[PDB]
Design an enzyme around this catalytic site. Structure first.
Site, PDB file in Angstrom:
ATOM      1  N   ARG B  78      11.259   5.719  -5.732  1.00 15.66           N
ATOM      2  CA  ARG B  78      10.013   5.484  -6.451  1.00 15.66           C
ATOM      3  C   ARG B  78       9.045   6.657  -6.272  1.00 15.66           C
ATOM      4  O   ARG B  78       8.693   7.016  -5.146  1.00 15.66           O
ATOM      5  CB  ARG B  78       9.326   4.241  -5.919  1.00 15.66           C
ATOM      6  N   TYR B  89      -1.197  11.216  -6.002  1.00 18.41           N
ATOM      7  CA  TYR B  89      -2.307  10.518  -5.291  1.00 18.41           C
ATOM      8  C   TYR B  89      -3.499  11.459  -5.141  1.00 18.41           C
ATOM      9  O   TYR B  89      -3.326  12.634  -4.813  1.00 18.41           O
ATOM     10  CB  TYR B  89      -1.840  10.041  -3.912  1.00 18.41           C
ATOM     11  N   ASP B 120      -4.819  -1.090   3.184  1.00 16.83           N
ATOM     12  CA  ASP B 120      -4.686   0.288   2.704  1.00 16.83           C
ATOM     13  C   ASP B 120      -5.936   1.133   2.932  1.00 16.83           C
ATOM     14  O   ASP B 120      -7.048   0.641   2.817  1.00 16.83           O
ATOM     15  CB  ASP B 120      -4.419   0.277   1.221  1.00 16.83           C
ATOM     16  N   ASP B 152      -5.859  -6.553  -2.693  1.00 19.95           N
ATOM     17  CA  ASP B 152      -5.393  -5.287  -2.192  1.00 19.95           C
ATOM     18  C   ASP B 152      -6.609  -4.406  -1.924  1.00 19.95           C
ATOM     19  O   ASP B 152      -6.952  -3.492  -2.693  1.00 19.95           O
ATOM     20  CB  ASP B 152      -4.464  -4.698  -3.212  1.00 19.95           C
TER      21      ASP B 152
END
Ligand SMILES: [Mg+2]
Ligand SMILES: [Mg+2]
Ligand SMILES: [Mg+2]
Ligand SMILES: [Mg+2]
Ligand SMILES: [Mg+2]
Ligand SMILES: [Mg+2]
Ligand SMILES: [Mg+2]
Ligand SMILES: [Mg+2]
Lengths: 276, 282
Positions: B78, B89, B120, B152
């Site tokens: 992935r 990112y 995260d 999240d």
């Protein structure tokens, strides 16, 4: 067949990349034909700088066979800084060979014309790719006319769908705005002013671009034949054009062999994102 | 001192990064203290993904000592795709150890279950991080992403060694020194799975970044969830390997687990398919 020959380690003062034809070095400026297919206006682009890198690599006018080397300022390697939201260069960045922006004819840089290649795949330094022109912008970089041709690799999956500048707005929405911003601000981290575009930053169309390219090529035709005002600075050795003053086949053989060196590390400072 | 132990070549299915202390593997999930300095709210961040990279590397909940391994999609590596105008990112991306976004409860702030992972962390400093790095960070704020419908949270943090760290104390300071970064962050987490055929994500609070106080509260909650989990007291531990080498009062303590890890077998990075270069215009 075109390949590259690397001397030294990447990101050092000794780094040089020569273009080879069938294993022999030729001039990246003078010996790669402007046209791959003149009838269909397919150009050869010499790639200098891969997308999303920082090292400011350029065809060198002053060295024999015009290898690509890293630009310096007062002895220090030059890197373009990351200008948020951009990461390094946002195009595969290069030049058309056999072009020259004659600084004695007027509306001039003394350099080959610059090319932004907007396709998906990241290019490599010294790559000769075949592209089609889509349009052109006129940046005023530090008091000078600095054309930026917008082009695409003919091998790109989108290439058949892009013929003119409006197609960039369609398939790559925001890229033209990003290109405007990038060239405006990219030297601000170096302590230089914001740059300005002519035509209010408009990208002129394919026909306009072809006109500019053809006119920088004609100039070059007379540089290498030797009939120009002043080829001062510029080294004009070539090895493919037998009836030119500066034909010197021996130039090929004088180039050192490929050094086999891993990339040198880049100072961590270059990671920095500037908000400007 | 924390170091890394790399197995294999980066960008392969065989690649693993274990975190070591004293040259010996510990659990990246359970054995790294959440707090480097409790009194000053300095956290240990485990970095998974360096800024401007694509490979979706994650602490592996199901593997003993929870090494960082590349995620896969139906057996293939992935990679997050490039979403214009972003490259990979746009943060140094990781997690806080000893935390758990509890999947067994609905979270009142978002009205959704937790994602089943450590909380995260987005680290916004100038230096690009490395996979398996343990760095010390200050929390600045937090955003509530609903990532495919799950809570999240994203903590906004900065390396205490960053030149700007002394001037960054709360979330408003991010806008001051990093203008546009928070808005770009909202956009990134909304669109980043669109090239994978998933829908646009959404945020709670209309994407507001809540402040440090709010952030510390949520981080505490996920640390408390982890404490329950690692004590064997979760209602459903989701197949997480709870093996650890530093927490003697837990039922899954085993100093020995560390010895069973193979030695480093670091190979040069494997090439990445050229498709991952592609810039998506959404
Ligand atoms: Mg230049
Ligand atoms: Mg140029
Ligand atoms: Mg210029
Ligand atoms: Mg130019
Ligand atoms: Mg995940
Ligand atoms: Mg995570
Ligand atoms: Mg998620
Ligand atoms: Mg998550």
């Amino acid at each position: 067949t075109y390949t590259t020959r690397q001397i030294g380690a990447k990101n050092t003062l000794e780094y040089k990349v020569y273009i080879e034809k069938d294993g022999k070095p030729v001039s990246a400026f003078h010996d790669i034909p402007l046209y791959a297919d003149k009838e269909n206006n397919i150009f050869n682009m010499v790639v200098e700088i891969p997308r999303w890198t920082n090292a400011k690599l350029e065809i060198t006018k002053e060295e024999t066979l015009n290898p690509i080397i890293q630009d310096t300022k007062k002895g220090k390697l030059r890197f373009v800084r990351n200008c948020f939201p951009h990461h390094g260069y946002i195009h595969n960045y290069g030049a058309f060979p056999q072009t020259w922006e004659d600084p004695n004819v007027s509306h001039g840089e003394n350099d080959p014309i610059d090319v932004l290649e907007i396709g998906e795949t990241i290019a490599y330094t010294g790559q000769v790719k075949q592209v089609k022109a889509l349009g052109i912008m006129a940046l005023l970089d530090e008091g000078e006319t600095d054309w930026k041709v917008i082009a695409i690799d003919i091998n790109d999956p989108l290439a058949p769908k892009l013929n003119d500048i409006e197609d960039v707005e369609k398939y790559f929405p925001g890229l033209l705005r990003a290109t405007n911003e990038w060239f405006r601000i990219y030297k601000i981290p170096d302590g230089k002013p914001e740059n300005q575009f002519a035509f209010s930053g408009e990208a002129k169309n394919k026909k306009y671009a072809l006109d500019i390219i053809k006119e920088t090529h004609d100039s070059w035709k007379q540089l290498i034949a030797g009939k120009s005002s002043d080829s001062k600075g510029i080294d004009l050795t070539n090895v493919t054009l037998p009836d030119t003053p500066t034909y010197s086949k021996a130039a090929s053989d004088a180039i050192p062999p490929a050094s086999l060196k891993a990339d040198a590390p880049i100072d961590k400072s270059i990671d920095k994102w500037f908000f400007i």
